[PDB]
Design a protein around this nucleic acid. Structure first.
Length: 50
DNA sequence: GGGTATTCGCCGCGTACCTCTCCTAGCCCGCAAGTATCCTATTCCTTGCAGCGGT
């Protein structure tokens, strides 16, 4: 059996540009299903929550 | 047990005299390694503007 499990698109953060979250802010707009971030710690949650 | 045999480690190896040379280690300072910072050039990257082409 095959299970459609494509690799994630190009998402990255870098402070070089004016808008660092450009790949994320465009990927989240053009995705129709859900999306689930997965963090390893609790404080890391806030490090991704802000 | 218990006697024989092989091995091992200590003790020993002349008296008196004469000449010569040579006898230093430990600590303080400045070097190295790592780490951290500031400071000053020096390159690199991003965005905004002047000139040129398409309509």
């Amino acid at each position: 059996a095959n299970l459609g499990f494509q690799k994630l698109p190009d998402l990255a953060v870098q402070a070089q540009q004016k808008a660092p979250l450009d790949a994320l802010r465009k990927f989240l707009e053009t995705f129709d299903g859900p999306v689930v971030f997965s963090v390893e710690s609790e404080g890391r949650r806030e490090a991704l929550g802000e």
